[PDB]
Amino acid sequence: AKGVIQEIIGVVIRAKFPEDEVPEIYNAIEIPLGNGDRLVCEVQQQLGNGVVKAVAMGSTDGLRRGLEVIDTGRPIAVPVGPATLGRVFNVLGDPIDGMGPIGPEVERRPIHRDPPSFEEQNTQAQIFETGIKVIDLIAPFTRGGKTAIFGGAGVGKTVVIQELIANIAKEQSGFSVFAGVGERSREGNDLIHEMKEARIDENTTVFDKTVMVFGQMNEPPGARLRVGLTALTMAEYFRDEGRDILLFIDNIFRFVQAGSEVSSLLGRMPSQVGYQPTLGTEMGELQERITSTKRGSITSMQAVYVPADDYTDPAPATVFSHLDATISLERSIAERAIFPAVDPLASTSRILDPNIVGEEHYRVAQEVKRVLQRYKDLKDIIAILGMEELSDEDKLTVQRARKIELFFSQPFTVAQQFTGRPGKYVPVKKTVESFARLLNGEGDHIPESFFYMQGDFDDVLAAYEA
Amino acid sequence: ITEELIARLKQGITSGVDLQPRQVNVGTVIAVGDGVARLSGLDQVVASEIVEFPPKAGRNESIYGIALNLEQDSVAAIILGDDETIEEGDMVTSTGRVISVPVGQGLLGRVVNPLGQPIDGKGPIVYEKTRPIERIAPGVITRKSVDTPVQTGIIAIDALIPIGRGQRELIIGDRQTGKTAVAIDTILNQKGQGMVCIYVAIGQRRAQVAQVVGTLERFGAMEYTIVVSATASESAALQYIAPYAGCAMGEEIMENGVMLNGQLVKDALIVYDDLSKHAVAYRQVSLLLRRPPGREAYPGDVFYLHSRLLERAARLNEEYGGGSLTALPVIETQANDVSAYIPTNVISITDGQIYLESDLFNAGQRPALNVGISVSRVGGAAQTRAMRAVAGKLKGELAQFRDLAAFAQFASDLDATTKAQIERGQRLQELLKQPQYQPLPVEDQVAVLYAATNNYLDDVPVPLITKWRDDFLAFLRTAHPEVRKLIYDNRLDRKFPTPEVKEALEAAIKEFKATSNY
Amino acid sequence: AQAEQERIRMLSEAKSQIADLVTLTASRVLGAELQARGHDALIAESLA
Amino acid sequence: AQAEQERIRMLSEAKSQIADLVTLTASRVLGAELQARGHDALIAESLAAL
Amino acid sequence: RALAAPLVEALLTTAAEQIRAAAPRIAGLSASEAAAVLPADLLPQVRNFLLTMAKEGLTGELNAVAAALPGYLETGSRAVDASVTSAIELSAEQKERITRELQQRYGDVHVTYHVDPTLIGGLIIRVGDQVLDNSLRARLSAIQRVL
Ligand SMILES: Nc1ncnc2c1ncn2[C@@H]1O[C@H](COP(=O)(O)OP(=O)(O)OP(=O)(O)O)[C@@H](O)[C@H]1O
């Protein structure tokens, strides 16, 4: 079970094993270094006579062409369990946080697992209750579904993630997993760790309810490739217990990019624009473990970065082939003190049909985003007509649009200790009733800024009465 | 009569087996790639056999593979199952059969793999005949001109872009636009039209295929529907052979037929849910086999790939059985890039296109058909005489409105005739708007279009036109059940608006309009 | 309920299964030499 | 008609079941027969079969 | 050493082939007996190797010498993996019997033994890319006939 390194070209290591003890296609190689630690590779191609080509997972700047390699038999084994909660891990499952190593008693599970069979899949889509009005109304999630935010920095995406974790941990058991795939180490780390450690709910920090796995841009392509699978295994452990899991794969696109590099260094023949031939299958093997079974559901809300602004590019197209909802965070909404920067438009969800959410939910969600279908196109007319002083009836529509745009904002519990305002959890039924009653005209008596940060229409009324 | 069992046995035991040992030729796996094995010297292997990979230590099952490349001193076999178990040195046995799938009455209402293995968990497939995947198209002289219509149930398709039995209409659209929605609406509408729908689901998510099967079961359409499924997580070989398995299952219906509702149905409808994903799977297979790429890295024989698949969909003449096999390929373009490689290939192959645009889908026209560019080369031959007689004015007025489509927001400051044309076009476009899972029968569509082409919806405001339809048919469904049957009975009459049905429909429309207020 | 005809039909141990075992195991699989005391008891206990 | 078809399928299933029993009991049998004698006889016969 | 490969390999293969071919005819001979038996037209070392083993009586092992003869001027890695599967675990004399009957395929090439207890009797002989099965093939062929 011990082989010898033959070739070393970058982060691709070729190793010759004995004839009858060749490692499998996804086993770990685990090259031992002189200074005590080890370099864990991952097999990718069995070939030749006992020779395996593997991805480094590390630097490989200190390795000769004769070093021994110890096949581990099983694929990359990652610690799963309640112990691996509130801790930060790398691709190999080694805790990179300040605290000590994971104890040997904790169960280790293979990184590569078979997605749930067809029989276990739910026969009817189900809405996922987040508690955010704009999210649960315009772009409802899916139990065991995928959602992508298209937003930069300073739009409160991190706060949205923190509130989603807090809400799922409060209303449900709601353990959460966060896989930063190919993230900036500044943004992904020490600005997610500190913000979630500072953010607190029921005297428990958000970080205490969240697992973190971080494969950053500095790590070799294999690490960024398999960090997503590490997070999937950690989440699937809890899913097997029946508990609902919310998983944030930050920059799933950087996953695809990683695979591309892994293919280019593996000698695979390029596909489309330099991308790997195994693009669809590689994305499926990661996006199919994110599904709602009978026992539990791994709901995922990913982040997608499109190169330039090309949605035609193979990586964004492959990502979109596996997406159930899109949330479009915008700078304009964020700079208007609207804490949830979710754009009422450009935020779609296939659940928004009367068969799943309900006829009333669909009707109001079409009533809203219709007064904004024009995006208040009147705003262009107001610019060169001044409303023609006033519009015959349009002026009402403008008032309703401004009121509902203000009402989309909601006080978040994670920000409760920052802005000094209690967090409001709004059920989907409360959201639909509030927006419907506002659109009937009950909301034509209150002025604006009374909808600025309040959970329900009833909460707005209490304020008007007081 | 157990003695019959004892007599049938004890005879084939004694003299039904040779039991003579003989050298058999096997192969050794010498390299396992990203789902590709090389199999070393396995001779006497057919160019598309399904090799076995017999069980070994640590594996109690068998993963099958397709011997796609018969190189010299090597046989690159694409693995159908999971490649993580097959290692170098494994023995392979060449099963002498090209991939075949079970067919017949047994596979109705069952979800199966492209290999015919059930995945719905409702029991083994009951069958007695296996049809070979990758058979030659029926032939030139074997077919007949398409005449029988396939009632989609959507007014836009069924009125402007006819689909007939044997016609291959392409559902091409951009990402989330309603292609699977249109296919499912077509499948649900064949409840009593004596057709066996087939859904292939190439590369779709397991969740999406599960929801499609749930929708079909919920509407009772899983008693005449065969669902094949090669999902995204499954190997590229399964996605590559899924549409061929589906169309073999459909060719069994076309040639031999099945007993549906106690009637011999020989018509089948097959929906390839993504040929844009089947092409991607075949591209991955080819590139992992190191075959020379072409444009967009697709292999040279990728036009041949879809051409074999779609050219088996035919309308057989009376000599060969009179069966049919309608194909509804589905393509996901990127940013409406119709000039892309696979979309152009399938557009050239197919007999028509249903262009679904994201602009109309987001605007509010939920069936997002673009009638300007969507064509059906079969045309009026794939429509009932009633719909053919009624939809001509619909098409003309819609074209006139499209010519004036830039003018809708300036309708007030225009000519009276131009304003009338714009208003009529808006009413017709709102009429074509349709909810999901609500297919309209042929008589209902004929009645609504007769009410629209004739000046009967002119007084109804545009935003209520849809509601008007949703009421009018209900009226005809309850108040006047006889006029619907009268329309349906003489829908094949050459001069469809015969005086009897004309007076009946006129009276029904007038009675509905008098009572209702809009 | 009529499927109990299968259960009543299969109650033919001496008629079919014993002779089928003897013929299949002796004449076909191995040579005609099948001589070891206890095969009848083994067949009887395995069939039950 | 479906009940008649299911009756035929039950007859076929019974035939397959008794086939499974005869094969499995013939595998159990002849194990002790080879253990007692003839273990090397089959080896020699196969080696000559090459 | 590199220049040796062609000529030395050819000579060693010729000697191995000559010894293997003369193994049937020259069995249990002596120096003069094998000199009259083994063809003298072979290589100068080949005839000497054929006669010397018979002179000492080791002519039966002379064919086995041929087995080492190619490997003396080769990497000796191209030995057929003649896997032998048998449910009964085999003794050392059994394995010797199998290898000595298996030398008819090349020589005493690399042979690996397995159990696969679910077999009954017989033995599965996988030489290179040819498999001979004689253990459970009969029963399952019979169950195919029955079904
Ligand atoms: N005719 C329709 N009526 C109402 N809603 C519709 C209709 N067509 C589509 N939709 C809505 O759009 C959503 C997406 O439609 P659908 O899944 O059919 O699209 P698609 O083109 O097959 O997409 P994908 O590329 O994701 O497979 C549906 O879930 C539904 O909410």
Ligand SMILES: [Mg+2]
């Ligand atoms: Mg679709």
